[PDB]
């Protein structure tokens, strides 16, 4: 149908929107301590702590897949990196630190995105 159409360009552009914010928000850890999943070979009992393990990598893959409906669900992805990382590392380390420079910086991109998203459509 023409409507089905319309709606896959909807989706398209969304996804094309949310490359250059998934772009910006990873530029925020030059470090790419969330680049990856976190390995268990290297950390075995990772699952035990974390149910919902997430990483750009990760993301990266269900964007390209066009896997992302709205902006919600893409945030809700990008909030996994950061509340996983601030559970299992302790407040001293350069991990959870990591983790707090990327929420506050991504916040910023993330309050435009939204703006974006409502203003498109």
């Given at each position: 149908s023409?409507?089905?159409?319309?709606?896959?360009?909807?989706?398209?552009?969304?996804?094309?929107?949310?490359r250059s914010v998934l772009?910006?928000?990873?530029?925020?850890?030059?470090?790419?301590i969330?680049?990856?999943?976190?390995?268990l070979?290297?950390?075995?009992?990772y699952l035990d702590h974390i149910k919902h393990p997430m990483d750009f990598a990760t993301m990266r893959k269900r964007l390209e897949a066009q896997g992302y409906k709205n902006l919600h669900?893409?945030?809700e992805d990008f909030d996994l990196i950061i509340?996983?990382?601030?559970?299992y590392n302790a407040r001293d380390t350069?991990?959870?630190?990591?983790?707090?420079?990327?929420?506050?910086?991504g916040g910023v991109v993330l309050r435009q995105a939204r703006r974006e998203v409502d203003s498109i459509g």
């Open positions: 023409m409507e089905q159409v319309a709606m896959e360009l909807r989706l398209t552009e969304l996804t094309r929107l949310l772009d910006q928000l990873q530029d925020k850890d030059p470090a790419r969330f680049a990856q999943p976190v390995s070979k290297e950390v075995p009992d669900e893409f945030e509340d996983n990382c601030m559970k350069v991990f959870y630190r990591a983790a707090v420079r990327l929420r506050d910086q």
